[PDB]
Amino acid sequence: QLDPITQAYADAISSRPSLFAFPLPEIRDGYQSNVSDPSTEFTTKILSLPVGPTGNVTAYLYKPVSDLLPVIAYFHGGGWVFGGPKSYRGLITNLIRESGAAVFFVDYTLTPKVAYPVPNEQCYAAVQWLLEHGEKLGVDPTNMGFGGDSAGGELSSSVSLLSIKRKTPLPKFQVLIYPATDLACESATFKEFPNGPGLTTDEIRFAASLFTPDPKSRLEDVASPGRASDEDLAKFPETLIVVAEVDPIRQQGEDFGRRLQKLGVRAAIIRVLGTIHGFASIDVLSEAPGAKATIELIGYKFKKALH
Amino acid sequence: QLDPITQAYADAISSRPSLFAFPLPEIRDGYQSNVSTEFTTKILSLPVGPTGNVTAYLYKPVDLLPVIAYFHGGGWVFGGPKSYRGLITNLIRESGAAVFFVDYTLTPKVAYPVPNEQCYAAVQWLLEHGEKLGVDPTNMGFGGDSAGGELSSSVSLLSIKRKTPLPKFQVLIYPATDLACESATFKEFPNGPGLTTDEIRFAASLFTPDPKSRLEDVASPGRASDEDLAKFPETLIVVAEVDPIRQQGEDFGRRLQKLGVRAAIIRVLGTIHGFASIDVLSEAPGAKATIELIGYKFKKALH
């Protein structure tokens, strides 16, 4: 059922207590290994953007070393509670290495210091900012990708939906990695994998309660882009969806994808067998065969779609 | 459930009669239409195998090239360099490797185990003579789709039984791994577009008329021993979702993982059997993405 590398990880993390319980650590971001090895190199610009509902969004612009670079706007996962530039260093260096693109990593504010729709709007505003200021930073905003995993997938598709509603430019290409696309309903696989390793169904309900304390929010399309209208969804950018087989959240990605296919959006949907939620960002899992191959595909696919 | 491009193709050939019926055409290979410049072509007559001859095509793209031994599909009844021109062009472009395309004899002109042994002997020849052809036999991949997947894993299994060099990397695309048993997806997609259970039975009766032949591990490497399978080279298995034989490639993958060989298994949703070589389908998003992945994975694995 699970590949060795993945099964070994799943064992050492039943040892673990749910990190998603009260109280929450003041620190929500950190290096997984601090290996501390490269050998893909990129420059970093730290950005304080005077935008978004809180007045400020922190972003990191990463550019690979050596006319305007393509740029991937990346929205990280971690249940809206955790994650950031440090814990996502592996995935970002992977994307950069394989895609040759710049990465615009939005370090949005974490729950519960804010709640829906503030992180969504922060992400959306960062992207607007990027559209306007990107060229003078050496990236080409007319050549943009969207990428996000889990919560970041929700944010990715949310930002896409908000762009459609506001008639601001969409990205050329979007990748959703086991996205949360419907916070309102429990799909078939919530049942199928109540504890099924790597992501518990109680860790899901909990993050939803911090992100969307008003359950009525979850029915809104900006919150749950899976519940968007046919008419809006039909305008989504070409989208690649990648899901883990053993994942409470698997059905959302697949449903969302089928929905796009039905509406005539170019949408590729790929399920990776023998792997668990988090395979794209957790360092250990990312070296398993299926994970490693699809991480490469994601990066390669940005490279081809973004020019 | 199927993406628009795939569904449109399915509607189109919904009327068209199955090729897997008598009379079989005299000509079993042909261009999907219509007529390289990205690679050279060398036709090889190999004085090997049970028939005395195995035809192979060495394709080289623009020090020693890596080389992919490719075993084409077509239910053992059809196929060759012409019908597979698209996939091969893709593989060469995406991978940067030479492709060593084994044009094994089709059925029922021959039958099991002759194609298997032809493919096996072709690889032994390549191992000996590759460097002289400008490729590196120590930097070798296997790929095959469907029947070609059966053939690929069969050559892998024979290499293990006979102690001859395995490849660095292997790609099986909706492979046939178990000719003896009917899987869950046989029932789930008995008629489902792209490949029917009727067609599977047809090809099986020509390739392996004796049911007992289907139980041999060389015919069905999915039934090999745990001891042998555990020595398989790192494998990537890609399957289509709506396909009677989907179940075979996944079961084979799980067994590889269970036995500790590096095995990646990927299911592509909304697409059918044949998406990797059928020119129309190749442009659908899922299909396009996985053909690229396959070519890319050969690039990464072969140096």
Numbering used by the authors:
A (entry chain A): 34 to 99, 107 to 347
B (entry chain C): 34 to 68, 72 to 98, 107 to 347
Paper quotes:
As expected for hydrolytic enzymes bearing a catalytic serine residue, TmelESTs were all irreversibly inhibited by phenylmethylsulfonyl fluoride (PMSF, 2 mM; data not shown). Additional details of the active site architecture were revealed by parallel analysis of a TmelEST2-PMSF structure, showing the sulfonyl fluoride group of the inhibitor covalently bound to the Oγ of Ser190 in all four monomers. In this structure, the Oα of the PMSF sulfonyl group is hydrogen-bonded to the NH groups of Gly119 and Ala191, while the benzyl group points toward Ala247 within the hydrophobic substrate tunnel. The structures of the catalytic domain, including the active site and the oxyanion hole, are, instead, essentially superimposable among the three enzymes and remain essentially unaltered upon PMSF incorporation, at least in the case of TmelEST2. The different kinetic properties of the Tuber carboxylesterases are thus likely to be ascribed to other regions of the protein and/or to subtle differences in active site flexibility or protein dynamics.
We present here the results of a detailed functional characterization and 3D structure analysis of these three T. melanosporum enzymes, designated as TmelEST 1, 2 and 3, which are shown to be non-lypolitic HSL carboxylesterases closely resembling archaeal and endosymbiotic soil bacteria esterases.
